[PDB]
Amino acid sequence: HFYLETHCTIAIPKGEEGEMELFVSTQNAMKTQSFVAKMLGVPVNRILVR
Amino acid sequence: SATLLFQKHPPANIQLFQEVPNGQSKEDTVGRPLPHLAAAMQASGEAVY
Amino acid sequence: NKENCWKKRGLCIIPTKFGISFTVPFLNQAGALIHVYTDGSVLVSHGGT
């Protein structure tokens, strides 16, 4: 692909109810959100992808 | 009584409220004494201000 | 009170009524936004804090 900006992710753990806010270079916030939730074992409504 | 030092008496607290309808679903918490959702995290210092 | 000279007790029962709503009509409006994600978990957002 050689997108000038390579893959990048910043993950911010809130420390509350498994909440996490992520800033990601992605075309798929939905899958990013569900995949992170699946790995963590928490409901999707706990993960925010921006 | 003018010579008596402050004396504290035993505290007594009674709360009266109404029970929810007999057959109300356990999943229906409206009317039940559900604790504040963030109480546990506030007690643990995990709640973020 | 008859038996005590330098200490006295008092008693009082009072009622109260408090009107509910903003007296300026336009502030009495509220919004909410709800999303149900594909795993069935629900995220609710509303104007209140």
Swiss-Prot record, chain A:
It is found in: Cytoplasm; Peroxisome; Secreted. Detected in milk (at protein level). Mo-molybdopterin binds at Q27. Subject to partial proteolysis; this alters the enzyme from the dehydrogenase form (D) to the oxidase form (O). It comes from the Eukaryota. Key enzyme in purine degradation. Catalyzes the oxidation of hypoxanthine to xanthine. Catalyzes the oxidation of xanthine to uric acid. Contributes to the generation of reactive oxygen species. This is Xanthine dehydrogenase/oxidase. It comes from Bos taurus (Bovine). The gene is XDH. The chain holds residues 741 to 790 of 1332 of the full protein.
UniProtKB/Swiss-Prot annotation, chain B:
Homodimer. Interacts with BTN1A1. Belongs to the xanthine dehydrogenase family. It comes from Bos taurus (Bovine). Subject to partial proteolysis; this alters the enzyme from the dehydrogenase form (D) to the oxidase form (O). Contains sulfhydryl groups that are easily oxidized (in vitro); this alters the enzyme from the dehydrogenase form (D) to the oxidase form (O). It is found in: Cytoplasm; Peroxisome; Secreted. This is Xanthine dehydrogenase/oxidase. It comes from the Eukaryota. Key enzyme in purine degradation. Catalyzes the oxidation of hypoxanthine to xanthine. Catalyzes the oxidation of xanthine to uric acid. Contributes to the generation of reactive oxygen species. Detected in milk (at protein level).
